[PDB]
Amino acid sequence: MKLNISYPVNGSQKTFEIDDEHRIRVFFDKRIGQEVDGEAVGDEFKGYVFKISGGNDKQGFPMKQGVLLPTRIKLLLTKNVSCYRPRRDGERKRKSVRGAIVGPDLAVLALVIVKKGEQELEGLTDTTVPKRLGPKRANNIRKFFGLSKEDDVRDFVIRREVTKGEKTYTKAPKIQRLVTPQRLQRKRHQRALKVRNAQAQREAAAEYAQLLAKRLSE
Amino acid sequence: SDAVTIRTRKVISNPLLARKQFVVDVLHPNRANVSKDELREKLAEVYKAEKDAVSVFGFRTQFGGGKSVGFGLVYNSVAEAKKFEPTYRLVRYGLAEKVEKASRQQRKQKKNRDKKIFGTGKRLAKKVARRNAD
Amino acid sequence: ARGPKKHLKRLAAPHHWLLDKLSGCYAPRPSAGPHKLRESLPLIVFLRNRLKYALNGREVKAILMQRHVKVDGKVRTDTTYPAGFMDVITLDATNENFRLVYDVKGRFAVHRITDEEASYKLGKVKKVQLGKKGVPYVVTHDGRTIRYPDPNIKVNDTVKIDLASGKITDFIKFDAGKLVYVTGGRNLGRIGTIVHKERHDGGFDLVHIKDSLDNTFVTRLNNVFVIGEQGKPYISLPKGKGIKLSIAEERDRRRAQQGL
RNA sequence: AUUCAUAAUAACUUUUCGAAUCGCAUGGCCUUGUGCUGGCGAUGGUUCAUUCAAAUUUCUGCCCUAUCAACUUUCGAUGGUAGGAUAGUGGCCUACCAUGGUUUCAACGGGUAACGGGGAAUAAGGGUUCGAUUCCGGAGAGGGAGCCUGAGAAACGGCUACCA
RNA sequence: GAAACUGCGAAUGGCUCAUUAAAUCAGUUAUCGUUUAUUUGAUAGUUCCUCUACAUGGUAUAACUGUGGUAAUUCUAGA
């Protein structure tokens, strides 16, 4: 029964193989979201604490958060939920899915480290991976670097490097939601447009009213 | 044969496209037919046109030979002749290049096969390599 | 059938487009705009089948989308923008101006006009109403709405929108002694003077119109379009001045044409 | 032709809308601040009108059959009031109350090898027969029902259930 | 300039004639009995306010990276 382990502190992922029915007995009758200990599952995993995250049965159907009765049932899934991706607007297929209570018929179970043990893992704790993309919004830049409101965050943007075959050059993300003379100019134009249109309406209404009074002088 | 004669009728100036449109008719009392490129060169030396900037497209010989009537149009400034013109005719006069593409069935089959891939398939390719490895 | 309709086949197009029944199995289908498609004229028909400028559909697409042809002093890029009656389509690269006025026989005509007089346009005011916030507004046959009109503009009448900002200049009344265009039914395209209007409460006030040559007739009031004083129309009338010749003297003048 | 358009008062609302968007241009002002202002467009946006439509709707018009003369109303049939529901009228439904409605001027039932029309064949006429089929309108995606999304679908080159 | 998000379209076409006998349909009206994205024309100095970002608030999530199951599906799980 394979075990997909993840360590989100550095974002490292691995697969482990446990093939004894007695060293896995502690895993039964727990739903996803529960917490187990790394003692009885492995002497290497002493001190480690796991949270049960997800998994797949022998047939390969996933497990759904919430549903009890660890059997396989068919559910009519809609947009913006797990286990389904809609093909067109409002499509709701009836997909079959497994209960979140872990039983013996599971084939793969996926866990998240919530507390590192006293010893470490060769391919998990030692290994670390960078995040693929830095922050893109300017206020997110400020929040990432801990900056001020007068700091001009365009100079702190991460510029990733690349070599085509020999000629090295870098590129950096286009900053979004920035203060810019274009935006101030557009806001200025909006205000001026509103006040000019309103004044034109007022003076035309006054001209119409005095025309009516001129007409009714008979 | 002594000569053909080329007469342009119903001449319309179209500055919306910067061109002139006309009905050519050629009297070829003996030869066989038009020799269309000679008409292109002739219409070039008629106005002033730099014969790669002209195009005559419609032609049909009258019954019993002699007279052939068609539609032809001249662009000034051969850049606009490459601009406002369909690509098949520009390939036909050698001022362009025909692209090669797979036929309609192969293009439709390729589109309807990569409709079955969500994303680049790099995960799918890597996964299938790993899963047929063992 | 489950929604709107986007195709218009040949044999279902308006007859006065003079569309050839072969060489294509579809008609332009004028997209929505100021006029009804049964009484409009798309840009593609006008530029392709009348002045012979374009030859294909993509040809007039490339003419238009170079931002050339302006309808009512505004640049249009749509191939089937429905230019309708009394519209003032203008071409910039030829310095030519046009005005859609119906021919005597019934279909649309190509009426060349000077650069002056192309800056105004008549419109039959169809309903006048006290609008939102207590302002008065007129809305005419071409979909234009004008706010703050003179109180004397009443229903079924004519105003004169120029092109610049609306702002209706001098307008016309509606009575006997006024020149009148007709734009619907059997007596389409005929210009004459109102002699009488009989009002039937409940609908369809018929109008008695006397032409130039004392051929009286009647139409419904929906087709009447008053264009000014008798003998003084504010536009340039089309060729022939709307007489509706009978076919016998049509034969007479047409063989009078033959011979030099 | 109106309790219309519109305006006013008293309030009310899981307070709707009233631009945190984008391209191209480098104009003008001086206290010369990288301060103030400014163009040509793009995309949205509430309401009203317009256009494309939609849905209901008045009058009149269909083939054969009396070996079909009574039909409809238990379980809405025709009408009244009031509510509910709908985009809205309306027995469309519900509660209560009335006993009506159609017909030998053919009701109701039955049959159709019936989708309807523009139209086609047939040259003395009027007619007799045809119109599944190039255009207009309706209905349906093996049979039924239900429904999400959307301005617009009871959609099936969308979904769910049952039947084959 | 792939992929994916967002917007729109996919309710038009095209096919067939099984149902249907005042039903459809045709001419003729009606909406003072209503819904309508789109197009066209007009349209919005009033917003929290007896202490406050307006030289501009916050969260996610796809695509992506890497970890996997299923014989199989335009299956998808967890990070």
Curated annotation (Swiss-Prot), chain A:
Q: What else does UniProt say about it? A: Present with 66000 molecules/cell in log phase SD medium.
Superkingdom assignment: Eukaryota
Question: Is Cytoplasm included in the keywords of this UniProt record?
Answer: yes
Q: Which UniProt keywords apply?
A: Cytoplasm, Isopeptide bond, Nucleus, Phosphoprotein, Ribonucleoprotein, Ribosomal protein, Ribosome biogenesis, rRNA processing, Ubl conjugation
Q: Where in the cell is it found?
A: Cytoplasm; Nucleus, Nucleolus
**Gene symbol of the encoding locus:** RPS6A
Record-listed Phosphothreonine modification sites: T163
| One GO process term, biological-process aspect | maturation of SSU-rRNA from tricistronic rRNA transcript (SSU-rRNA, 5.8S rRNA, LSU-rRNA)
Q: Does the keyword Hydrolase apply?
A: no
Residue location of crosslink Glycyl lysine isopeptide (Lys-Gly) (interchain with G-Cter in ubiquitin): K116, K131, K149, K214
Protein name (Swiss-Prot/TrEMBL): Small ribosomal subunit protein eS6A
The Swiss-Prot or TrEMBL record describes its family as follows:
Belongs to the eukaryotic ribosomal protein eS6 family.
One CC-aspect GO term: cytosol
UniProtKB/Swiss-Prot annotation, chain B:
Give cross-link positions for Glycyl lysine isopeptide (Lys-Gly) (interchain with G-Cter in ubiquitin). K20
Residues where N-acetylserine is found: S1
What GO MF annotations does this protein's record show?
structural constituent of ribosome
* Keywords, alphabetical: Acetylation, Cytoplasm, Isopeptide bond, Phosphoprotein, Ribonucleoprotein, Ribosomal protein, Ubl conjugation
Gene3D superfamilies with a match to the protein in the record: 3.30.70.3370
* GO CC annotations on file: cytosol; cytosolic small ribosomal subunit; mitochondrion
Is the Ubl conjugation keyword given for this protein? yes
Q: How is it modified after translation?
A: N-terminally acetylated by acetyltransferase NatA. Also partially acetylated by NatC.
* Record's miscellaneous remark: There are 2 genes for eS24 in yeast.
Q: Which PANTHER family match?
A: 40S RIBOSOMAL PROTEIN S24
Q: What is this protein called?
A: Small ribosomal subunit protein eS24A
Which source organism? Answer: Saccharomyces cerevisiae (strain ATCC 204508 / S288c) (Baker's yeast)
Q: What is the lineage of its organism?
A: Eukaryota, Fungi, Dikarya, Ascomycota, Saccharomycotina
From Swiss-Prot, chain C:
From what superkingdom does this record's organism come?
Eukaryota
PTM-bearing positions, type Phosphoserine:
S31, S246
Q: Which InterPro entries match?
A: KOW, Rib_uL2_dom2, Ribosomal_eS4, Ribosomal_eS4_C, Ribosomal_eS4_central_region, Ribosomal_eS4_central_sf, Ribosomal_eS4_KOW, Ribosomal_eS4_N
GO CC, alphabetical: 90S preribosome; cytoplasm; cytosol; cytosolic small ribosomal subunit
Keywords recorded for this protein, A-Z: Cytoplasm, Isopeptide bond, Phosphoprotein, Ribonucleoprotein, Ribosomal protein, RNA-binding, rRNA-binding, Ubl conjugation
> Cross-referenced Pfam families, in alphabetical order?
40S_S4_C, KOW, Ribosomal_S4e, RS4NT, S4
CDD domains (alphabetical): KOW_RPS4, S4
Tell me where in this chain the PTM Phosphothreonine is found.
T114
SMART domains from the UniProt entry: S4
**What region holds the S4 RNA-binding domain?**
41-104
Q: Which GO terms describe its molecular function?
A: RNA binding; rRNA binding; structural constituent of ribosome
GO terms classed as biological process: cytoplasmic translation; translation
Q: Where in the cell is it found?
A: Cytoplasm
The annotated crosslink position for Glycyl lysine isopeptide (Lys-Gly) (interchain with G-Cter in ubiquitin) is K61, K133, K160, K167, K173, K178, K210, K232
- Quaternary structure and interacting proteins, as annotated: Component of the small ribosomal subunit (SSU). Mature yeast ribosomes consist of a small (40S) and a large (60S) subunit. The 40S small subunit contains 1 molecule of ribosomal RNA (18S rRNA) and 33 different proteins (encoded by 57 genes). The large 60S subunit contains 3 rRNA molecules (25S, 5.8S and 5S rRNA) and 46 different proteins (encoded by 81 genes).
Q: What PANTHER family does its record include?
A: 30S/40S RIBOSOMAL PROTEIN S4, SMALL RIBOSOMAL SUBUNIT PROTEIN ES4
UniProt miscellaneous comment: Present with 573 molecules/cell in log phase SD medium.
Homology family: Belongs to the eukaryotic ribosomal protein eS4 family.
Described purpose of this protein according to its UniProt entry: Component of the ribosome, a large ribonucleoprotein complex responsible for the synthesis of proteins in the cell. The small ribosomal subunit (SSU) binds messenger RNAs (mRNAs) and translates the encoded message by selecting cognate aminoacyl-transfer RNA (tRNA) molecules. The large subunit (LSU) contains the ribosomal catalytic site termed the peptidyl transferase center (PTC), which catalyzes the formation of peptide bonds, thereby polymerizing the amino acids delivered by tRNAs into a polypeptide chain.
What's the name of the protein? Small ribosomal subunit protein eS4A
